[PDB]
Design a protein around this ligand. Structure first.
Ligand SMILES: O=C(NCC1CCN(c2ncccn2)CC1)N1CCCC1
Ligand SMILES: O=C(NCC1CCN(c2ncccn2)CC1)N1CCCC1
Ligand SMILES: O=C(NCC1CCN(c2ncccn2)CC1)N1CCCC1
Ligand SMILES: O=C(NCC1CCN(c2ncccn2)CC1)N1CCCC1
Lengths: 193, 193
């Protein structure tokens, strides 16, 4: 039941390693899932809905992880606390690079994908800003830029820079160096006078 | 001569204010330029080549401006020196937002557009890194991250954050606040211990 649904999702993620969604047909997905074409259409309306489900699954995994961390602070210094959050993305999206690439390709023209991403970004930006504001209130960080603006730019930086790293874009920070690079810019800009 | 070429480019930029390149036909461009379809094909091979030319023109304008600044340093403090460079983008791409939007949409699937962007980003990243290295050598900045990695992340941040601002994306830093936001993150991360 969910078995055929899971098989379809698995096939799509496997195929997305090799080519883009426009070179993948519903028939390829059904065939990889061991089902016929009209059976496919009972679980999904289109190959784009399959991508949307993969993306929704990845983004919810990252969001649940961050929600765990937020409830269970590490006992370590500030620099390590920001690193542990950024590492959620580095690990979760970094474990699903083909899905990430296809999501980015899609939101060029898909309103559902853009909106899904936006909702989550708003949430994590707000959380980031709430932390920065808490740090200023406790006297740990200086009141420099408006926290929400700062949190928007640092979150967008991470989106773009992790994407380029995972893609191996030229230019890009090597994947082995991207987390230390991001952490340095977050700590200096949040705590720096 | 260049007159009909200039008219075609002008028509394409005007139309790109209203819809994407996929809703624009060669016939629309010719008609707006006052020429026939086969006459269009004498100046350009396709509507995509017209976009590529607009993009090449915008990116060369920004690059020539930065080359002017690099040759003619302002007499002001460090913070203002970085602001003057970032402002080149804010002004040049910000004066051509529809072309910028269409360029971003395109590089989702166009190798020529991706490569053109990449070449220039490499150049400005290298320049940024050379400055950071000069600042460390003169004892004005601390030796923290490798300069080239730092310069890659800060340049990618600007690309993504200015794009979102100019687009009015949700989330995005308002256009009136984006330059001060970027400058703060560049100065703290370059000069911050
Ligand atoms: O790296 C990021 N964001 C990092 C932030 C860091 C702070 N934060 C968080 N920290 C501790 C617990 C829960 N949340 C929210 C996530 N992004 C890449 C794709 C878009 C966002
Ligand atoms: O590039 C990004 N984020 C932006 C894209 C947006 C499209 N898309 C997506 N995914 C889930 C839900 C909705 N949209 C894949 C992510 N990252 C690189 C690694 C960290 C996140
Ligand atoms: O805002 C940026 N980059 C800013 C840098 C700042 C330093 N710099 C420069 N400074 C003084 C003179 C010449 N060059 C090179 C450009 N970007 C947005 C799109 C991609 C790059
Ligand atoms: O988003 C960006 N940059 C990236 C895109 C890349 C596609 N594209 C482009 N343009 C010229 C030459 C090649 N590609 C338009 C720019 N910016 C926002 C304002 C500052 C630059």
């Amino acid at each position: 039941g969910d078995d055929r649904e899971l098989a379809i999702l698995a096939t799509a993620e496997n195929l997305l390693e090799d080519r883009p969604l426009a070179d993948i047909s519903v028939d390829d997905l059904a065939k990889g899932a061991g089902i016929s074409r009209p059976t496919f259409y009972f679980y999904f309306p289109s190959k784009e809905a399959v991508l949307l489900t993969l993306l929704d699954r990845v983004v919810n995994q990252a969001d649940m992880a961050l929600q765990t961390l937020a409830e269970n602070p590490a006992d370590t210094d500030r620099e390590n606390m920001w690193r542990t959050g950024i590492n959620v993305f580095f690990e979760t999206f970094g474990s699903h690079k083909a899905v990430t690439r296809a999501g980015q390709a899609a939101r060029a023209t898909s309103v559902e994908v853009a909106e899904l991403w936006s909702t989550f970004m708003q949430k994590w930006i707000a959380y980031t800003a709430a932390v920065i504001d808490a740090e200023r209130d406790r006297g740990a960080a200086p009141r420099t830029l408006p926290a929400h603006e700062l949190a928007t730019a640092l979150n967008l930086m991470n989106e773009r820079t992790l994407f380029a790293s995972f893609a191996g874009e030229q230019p890009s920070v090597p994947e082995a160096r991207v987390l230390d690079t991001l952490v340095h810019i977050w700590v200096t800009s949040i705590y720096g006078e």
